[PDB]
Design a protein around this ligand. Sequence first.
Ligand code: GI8
Ligand code: GI8
Ligand code: PLG
Ligand code: PLG
Ligand code: CL
Lengths: 442, 442
Amino acid sequence: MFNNEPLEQIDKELHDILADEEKRQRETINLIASENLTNGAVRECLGNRVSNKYSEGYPKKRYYGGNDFIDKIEELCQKRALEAFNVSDEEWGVNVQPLSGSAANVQALYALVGVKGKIMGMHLCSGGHLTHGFFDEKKKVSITSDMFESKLYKCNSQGYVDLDAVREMALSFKPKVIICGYTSYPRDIDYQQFRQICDEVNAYLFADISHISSFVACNILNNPFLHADVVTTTTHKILRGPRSALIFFNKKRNPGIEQKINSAVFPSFQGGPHNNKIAAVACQLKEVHSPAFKEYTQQVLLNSKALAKALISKQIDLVTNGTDNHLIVVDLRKFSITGSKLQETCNAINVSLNKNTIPSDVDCVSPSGVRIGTPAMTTRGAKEKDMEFIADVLARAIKITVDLQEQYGKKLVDFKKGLPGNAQLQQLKQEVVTWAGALPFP
Amino acid sequence: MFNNEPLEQIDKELHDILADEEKRQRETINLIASENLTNGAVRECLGNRVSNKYSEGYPKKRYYGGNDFIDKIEELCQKRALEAFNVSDEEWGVNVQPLSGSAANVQALYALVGVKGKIMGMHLCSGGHLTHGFFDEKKKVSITSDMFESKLYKCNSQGYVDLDAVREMALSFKPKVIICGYTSYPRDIDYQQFRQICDEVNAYLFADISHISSFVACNILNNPFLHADVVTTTTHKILRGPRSALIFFNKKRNPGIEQKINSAVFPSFQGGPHNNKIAAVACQLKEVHSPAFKEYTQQVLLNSKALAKALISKQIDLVTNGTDNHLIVVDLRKFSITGSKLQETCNAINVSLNKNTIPSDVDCVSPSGVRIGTPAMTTRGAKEKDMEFIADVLARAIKITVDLQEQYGKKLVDFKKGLPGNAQLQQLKQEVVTWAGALPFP
Ligand SMILES: COCc1ccc(-c2cc(C#N)cc([C@@]3(C(C)C)C(C#N)=C(N)Oc4n[nH]c(C)c43)c2)s1
Ligand SMILES: COCc1ccc(-c2cc(C#N)cc([C@@]3(C(C)C)C(C#N)=C(N)Oc4n[nH]c(C)c43)c2)s1
Ligand SMILES: Cc1ncc(COP(=O)(O)O)c(CNCC(=O)O)c1O
Ligand SMILES: Cc1ncc(COP(=O)(O)O)c(CNCC(=O)O)c1O
Ligand SMILES: [Cl-]
């Protein structure tokens, strides 16, 4: 008693937009640092009937019948997660049920500190996440600043984490958790240094490695598992998995953390797991552990180094003057333009990026930077040689932006008036589409 | 620079379990009240590349470029959501980003009351959800009992919502929110009555209709939208959508609630939306509004009435002695067995259900009932005549459970010893598989 017609026949309106979205994807230079493109295997999992199952609880301890195969799927995922990060299942445990990074982080923090608990995070303007305790004067923007008491450490004027400031703050504030690992931080992390600071104030060490997860797995960047109590990561970014998250806990450093973390995920916060996610994560995790994915990850950094190099060669300023990973933040101050305007210009030419703050910024709405990343284009087979081209495309977008600000003015509404029908933008978009459309598309 | 081998070739281990799960689903009599089976169209959406996109914020108000088609999909979902529940976009608004029912509820509650805020909900043992403020004497089981201050109302010994008790509690406790609409409540709800109590005490009216959403939409049961400030519902249950949730808010009753709810979903709790979810919800909502889905929803109740009738004819006791909806709770006390045991026995025969508490219950690990539901089997084309068979199968499982308890004992571990190889169970499972395996399967 159901309709079985395929999507095209059953919902032609929706299918058209999705075909449109697909085309836009195929024809964009995607520089969103947090984006990637999943393979068919991961999407076959997301589309699977395994999402039919209600399976509240944990494997072997469900609140429903019919969970025999779901248990195998949940355990294989946990297995592959611990494998992927080269941690012994004896020392480290993992929860594979958080629906997304924001959820995982809120869950993990509560497990560690509870309501009104004290937490320390990097500020949003400095590269930190919303879920790292963010608030402004006016409002408690994230729940992490409301259900928890938070204080926020800023990076220095150069854009690097100031460990001195971190220690200064920890000794006065006395938090139960300190969060490191970031959303738009272009440099590696001194985890050991964080560990020594946490030890001084009897605080937990929280490493959110969502952006840099593939580097950690493939042993290309610092390994937070050597020092961290809790490691979170999303699966949809550099890891190239589906949209989901993982919570890792050091059982050996903290006995009874397993129960604490697991009870926080369920039944404190979530209900039924999304088993299609868990299946998809499992699939990607197998791939994460291969020598071939290590190659992909290496190429991500090769590409990011080259892109930084080529942008510098064109007189563009970068926060920290380079990168240790997949991501770059461009400081646009010398051009007297905003990230907001550069975002609109880049969208008009099919270049995906986002506006981003820099250390000197005081404005969340009008930032002085854009953030770019290589994981998506690296997935699409782009190499170091291709980076000069992206660098050139961005330079030209910056120039065009300066011109349009000259013609139409500083107001964002006024500025957008110049984008449609602009001859150079049309020429640039076509230039973008031609190269982007030809690249391998999973 | 990726792998494009299909799931079968890329990950054979995982593909086998999924095919195993698919086989089990096809050959199970699914009586889990919160379960359904999605069509291929909904699964093509969950599998779509649209999940590649990061689109934090709201349509037209994104924090990333290249969201032109993502905006159309998020808007068409809001459009179809309000359409399906027969509400005007001028009076009612909706958020389509909550990832699941538990998140949406925590999100919606925070919006209304904030941290330390006061809320009222039905007790878990009485039929209410975890996210309705549930706590134990020992522990604050749900975050809804911890980040909020909660009180819990119990149904009477007959299993009906006791409005006297609700009012008595509301006048003393003075909550800011009162929650109605439930997880395992077999009767319709007097929303008007709740509204009168909420008015008296200046409390918001919260109706969580996840279990009964299709009834509300198709105007087969009481409409909470006539009276409620906030309406939440998951999409994966009787709605037969993907795993996601919706928050509805009455703008006419509460100006400024839109910003409150929207900011609570993001950036208070979540980060990037799951666009494949939104696409899938949109697709199912078109179907919800059709006269053909009204037919399906009618069948669900016709089947649930019949099944209740047939169980009573076999001397099985029901909570409230019947049903107003898709769900029944069987009181097993007269048989001196637990739901836990009946759940294992039913799993052994390919009958999916869950153990459920009853009003006299004081125990959560071992309850005195099972909960059953018709949405899945109705989806599979089963009619009123088919219900006698399901009733017969359950009666037979109950008997086998009494026998096995006599032989092996009251300990759950001891009891399970008797399940494998049992000739009657093998006979019953085969009877189950034959009939279920031949039913239409989306
Ligand atoms: C309405 O509350 C104030 C805000 C919520 C999110 C804000 C935000 C603004 C900007 C800018 N420009 C950038 C961000 C960024 C980037 C990555 C997009 C951002 C930056 N820069 C950082 N550090 O973390 C984030 N988490 N989520 C989002 C959307 C961000 C966040 S401002
Ligand atoms: C951590 O200990 C406290 C608990 C968490 C879940 C508990 C629970 C036990 C039983 C039993 N028997 C039943 C439930 C039910 C049913 C639908 C399965 C349940 C019941 N009965 C109700 N009312 O709501 C629920 N939300 N989530 C779950 C799993 C439930 C929940 S008790
Ligand atoms: C470090 C970090 N942690 C958690 C999250 C949250 O994940 P969800 O959005 O899946 O909830 C993000 C999102 N990052 C925003 C970006 O870099 O584009 C992040 O950068
Ligand atoms: C009334 C109600 N509200 C919210 C939820 C939460 O949904 P998620 O599991 O998607 O977070 C449930 C789950 N229902 C459990 C059951 O009836 O089987 C529910 O029954
Ligand atoms: Cl999903």
